[PDB]
Amino acid sequence: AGEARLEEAVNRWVLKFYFHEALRAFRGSRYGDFRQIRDIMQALLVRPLGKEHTVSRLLRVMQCLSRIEEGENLDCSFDMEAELTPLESAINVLEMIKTEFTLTEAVVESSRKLVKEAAVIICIKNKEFEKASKILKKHMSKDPTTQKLRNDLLNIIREKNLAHPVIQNFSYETFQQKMLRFLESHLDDAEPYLLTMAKKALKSESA
Amino acid sequence: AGEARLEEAVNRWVLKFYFHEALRAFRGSRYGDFRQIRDIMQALLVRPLGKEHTVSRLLRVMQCLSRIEEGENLDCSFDMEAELTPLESAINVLEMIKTEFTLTEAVVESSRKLVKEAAVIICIKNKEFEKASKILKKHMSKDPTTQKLRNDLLNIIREKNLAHPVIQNFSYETFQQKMLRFLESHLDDAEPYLLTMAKKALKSESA
């Protein structure tokens, strides 16, 4: 009863502390640490957290980042249906973020363009041309402002031109960091309670 | 914009009408109709519904019932992990209902006992003895009030006694109807808007 209220409070503190450390690892390109921290958070989810809309946003972000971090591994499946590559799965999470964070198409569009682009190109690098075409056609926009990129890609899949500048100039690292940038902007900048108490406590000590 | 607000309203009316028809089919043991209606609702979920906590409850109920209806088919998997038989998956949905509907252990207990019992016995009927044992041990309660049932079952798995009264007297139909009874009690009894307008409209006509 009370013991569960108290556990809830701690669990949320734990969750927020690790989320903060997960973003820091991600920002520092320490993806190994990111994944391990991600697993700790995954384990905490079966426990009572209560309600904060702060954690749902928190969790939607982790969700998207987790899929983006494993984006270059087409052996991974974050979904019921094996079909979905991690990035395709990231697109779906982004759509959930749009709806839940009540964001406009214009705001989510830039992010999305980057994820769709990355999804197609990673498939192309693995010469999963057929898969790249399907992803391109279902997701890719046909906007007048993206039609050239879409045509280049469609053509690259055509000739299987893995040597095309579009493919060679693609930086997954930059892609990842830009995505973190965007997702990060829908979160508060505060220091999680535990890190605060850890900075205090840690300086009780000395010498 | 507005067009999406309006679609939301209709979608919720559609969802509630079919939920109502799904329960009616279930109550009438017309599981074929239930499944088809379930698929219509599954399709609507990708669409905008908005917020009503009324639909979340609605959906958690459909979720549990859907797993219970396919309970005797151990080839079905409603989960990420193939391991889970439908009923085991129903237990998980029930736990979600408890938390979300903020129900007490005493209230959810009876339902749960029935689902756990059914899960074990269906595995036993298919002579999935090992599976039945694992489910028994992880989920089954050890309460003083259920220990005899647990021992009988453990023994039945022992001798592979599919002819034991406990196995032979088990009625999946009665189990299903009792579960509907319980889940139904956390929902309002009102007539969905569309059925109301359908009763009016339908009686404009005559002769």
């Binding site: 697993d39 995954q42 982790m62 987790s66 | -």
Partner: peptide, 10 residues
């Protein structure tokens, strides 16, 4: 929420 980590299998 739903899953942070993947399931293996693609």
């Amino acid at each position: 929420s739903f899953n942070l980590a993947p399931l293996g299998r693609r």
